[PDB]
């Protein structure tokens, strides 16, 4: 639910200082985009479902 997501939050919030030694930031941000997109899809579907 959030136990593996708050870790990603803190991991991005710690890796804002180096910002170039870690190339894996982009895939993590793509998964943030996926989570935001799925959340918006679910909110529209909950608006239609009611």
């Amino acid at each position: 639910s959030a136990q593996l997501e708050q870790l990603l939050y803190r991991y991005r919030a710690i890796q804002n200082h180096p910002k170039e030694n870690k190339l894996e930031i982009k895939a993590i941000e793509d998964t943030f985009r996926n989570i935001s997109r799925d959340q918006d899809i679910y909110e529209t579907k909950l608006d239609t479902l009611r």
């Binding site: 639910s1 959030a2 943030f32 935001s36 959340q39 679910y42």
Partner: peptide
């Protein structure tokens, strides 16, 4: 990347 559509998150809404 939004903000309130990113803290409100379950596995019950990924599908």
């Amino acid at each position: 990347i939004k903000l309130q559509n990113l803290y409100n998150w379950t596995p019950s809404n990924y599908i």
